[PDB]
Amino acid sequence: GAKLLQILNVRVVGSGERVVVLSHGFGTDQSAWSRVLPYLTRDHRVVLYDLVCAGSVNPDHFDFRRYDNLDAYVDDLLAILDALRIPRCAFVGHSVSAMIGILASIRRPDLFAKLVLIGASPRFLNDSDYHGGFELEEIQQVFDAMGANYSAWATGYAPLAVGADVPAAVQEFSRTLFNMRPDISLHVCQTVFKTDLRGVLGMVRAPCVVVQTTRDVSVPASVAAYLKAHLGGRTTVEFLQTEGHLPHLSAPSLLAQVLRRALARY
Numbered sequence: 014g015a016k017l018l019q020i021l022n023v024r025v026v027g028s029g030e031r032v033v034v035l036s037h038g039f040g041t042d043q044s045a046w047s048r049v050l051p052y053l054t055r056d057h058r059v060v061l062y063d064l065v066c067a068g069s070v071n072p073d074h075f076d077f078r079r080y081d082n083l084d085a086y087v088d089d090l091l092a093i094l095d096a097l098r099i100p101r102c103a104f105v106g107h108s109v110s111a112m113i114g115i116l117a118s119i120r121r122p123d124l125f126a127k128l129v130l131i132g133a134s135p136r137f138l139n140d141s142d143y144h145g146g147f148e149l150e151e152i153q154q155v156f157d158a159m160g161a162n163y164s165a166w167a168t169g170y171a172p173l174a175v176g177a178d179v180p181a182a183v184q185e186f187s188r189t190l191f192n193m194r195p196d197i198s199l200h201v202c203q204t205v206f207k208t209d210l211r212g213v214l215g216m217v218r219a220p221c222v223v224v225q226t227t228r229d230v231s232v233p234a235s236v237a238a239y240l241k242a243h244l245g246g247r248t249t250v251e252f253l254q255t256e257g258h259l260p261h262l263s264a265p266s267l268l269a270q271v272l273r274r275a276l277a278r279y
């Protein structure tokens with residue numbers, strides 16, 4: 014309840030009758046939302062928190078057996094909302110949090126009025142007649158890299174993830190990426206890559222906006238199309254006119270426009 018609010022560094026800011034949850038992705042924490050936040054705070058009550066795997070959350074609270082699937086992250090999210098006494102909200106989440114949001118909307122359809130998914134994929138691994146963008150050997154090489162020299166891995170990965178040449182964004186992402194516990198980073202990455210949400214997408218009742226950039230290193234353009242086609246609710250794909258996996262860091266003013274539009278009516 015209240016302790017969880019402290020453990021996950023929960024914050025509520027802004028004024029408006031409508032509630033939005035901003036849920037960060039891998040390698041970041043809630044500070045990643047800082048640039049888009051001012052566009053929202055006039056019209057919304059905004060909840061921010063850190064995922065348990067965030068570097069800004071004490072690694073002692075991370076349970077390796079518990080967090081071995083995304084449903085545990087969903088537990089934390091639902092427990093946060095119930096603690097804050099929020100009966101209904103819109104959920105915006107990035108990367109792994111998009112996955113968490115999908116699962117939470119299935120668990121508690123009454124709680125989630127709308128989903129906005131950024132850099133979202135149901136499955137990263139390739140399959141028969143499914144292009145996720147990665148092959149088993151490719152991902153294996155990553156795990157080895159994260160395992161052998163983590164900082165070296167992080168140094169190489171951060172600019173690929175940002176993907177546009179935006180030195181300040183690369184730096185901000187590196188701050189929170191390097192500060193992650195290397196073993197927790199690997200674990201989350203292993204959990205995510207073993208996740209296949211394709212089968213449950215049809216169970217989502219909430220209207221969804223899939224936000225897609227021109228180039229995402231972990232998310233092929235065809236995946237956004239797949240989500241729109243297979244999500245059970247009314248779904249639209251919004252395209253950003255710029256590239257990268259972290260548009261809230263790399264082009265926050267552009268992402269804010271799509272968000273303001275997506276959160277207009279839910």
Ligand SMILES: CC1=C[C@H](O/C=C2/C(=O)O[C@@H]3c4ccccc4C[C@H]23)OC1=O
Nearest residue numbers: 038039040108109155173202205230231
């Ligand atoms: C949860 C989440 C998944 C996602 O892809 C994560 C990746 C990672 O860690 O190494 C992988 C890799 C290896 C080489 C080049 C790019 C990437 C991106 C892949 O981005 C996220 O935030």
